[PDB]
Amino acid sequence: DPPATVYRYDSRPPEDVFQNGFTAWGNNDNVLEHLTGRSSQVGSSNSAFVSTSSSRRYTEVYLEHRMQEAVEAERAGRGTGHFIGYIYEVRADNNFYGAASSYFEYVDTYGDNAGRILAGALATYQSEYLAHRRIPPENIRRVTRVYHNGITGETTTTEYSNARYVSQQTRANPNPYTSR
Numbered sequence: 575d576p577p578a579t580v581y582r583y584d585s586r587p588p589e590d591v592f593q594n595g596f597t598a599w600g601n602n603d604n605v606l607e608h609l610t611g612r613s614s615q616v617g618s619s620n621s622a623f624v625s626t627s628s629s630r631r632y633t634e635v636y637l638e639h640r641m642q643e644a645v646e647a648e649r650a651g652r653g654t655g656h657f658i659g660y661i662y663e664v665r666a667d668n669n670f671y672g673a674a675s676s677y678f679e680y681v682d683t684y685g686d687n688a689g690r691i692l693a694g695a696l697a698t699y700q701s702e703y704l705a706h707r708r709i710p711p712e713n714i715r716r717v718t719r720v721y722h723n724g725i726t727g728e729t730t731t732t733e734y735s736n737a738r739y740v741s742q743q744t745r746a747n748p749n750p751y752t753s754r
């Protein structure tokens with residue numbers, strides 16, 4: 575079945591996320607622009623989607639990469655090396671859509687052939703799920719905080735549960751996302 579639980583790395587703390595949920599950047603509803611990295615923060619910063627992963631490890635690799643960038647910066651004399659990152663554990667519902675199936679629906683209908691046909695399961699956004707527009711706070715179950723001390727190298731991990739989380743039987747949508 576589609577996953578009931580997904581994960582999201584984010585820099586923002588639970589005082590924000592546990593109360594307000596996640597809100598997408600904007601109204602850019604183009605799935606292909608989102609999945610290929612064009613409409614999030616380092617691009618046009620207007621995507622209508624919020625990425626998550628069914629694989630906790632995927633989000634841990636993301637956190638580890640961002641922490642390592644802070645470390646490299648300290649060594650280059652460009653920062654103190656400190657880093658705080660968060661991994662949120664989230665209940666998926668019918669407003670969460672598989673990236674792989676959504677990608678294929680889009681490119682089969684509107685794409686050219688680039689990456690349409692030669693696109694295996696491990697290669698094609700294997701574990702990514704897109705929440706459309708919002709991840710409400712009631713879906714956000716808990717968070718792991720990882721703090722790296724840039725000066726001593728000590729890394730400390732803590733956990734917090736969201737009092738606003740609602741436990742209900744939901745899973746991600748079985749169908750691809752389609753706009754409109």
Ligand SMILES: NC(=O)c1cccc(N[C@H]2O[C@H](COP(=O)(O)OP(=O)(O)OC[C@H]3O[C@@H](n4cnc5c(N)ncnc54)[C@H](O)[C@@H]3O)[C@@H](O)[C@H]2O)c1
Nearest residue numbers: 582583584585597598599609611614615625626627633702
């Ligand atoms: N985030 C994940 O764990 C994740 C899980 C599975 C797959 C992916 N694959 C994505 O990686 C790339 C980066 O994804 P995100 O980190 O989700 O990109 P965002 O732009 O949503 O978030 C980056 C940062 O931008 C900030 N932010 C994000 N949304 C808002 C907002 N609405 N308002 C203010 N700040 C915001 C916040 O600092 C956040 O950590 C995307 O191009 C896409 O390919 C990401």
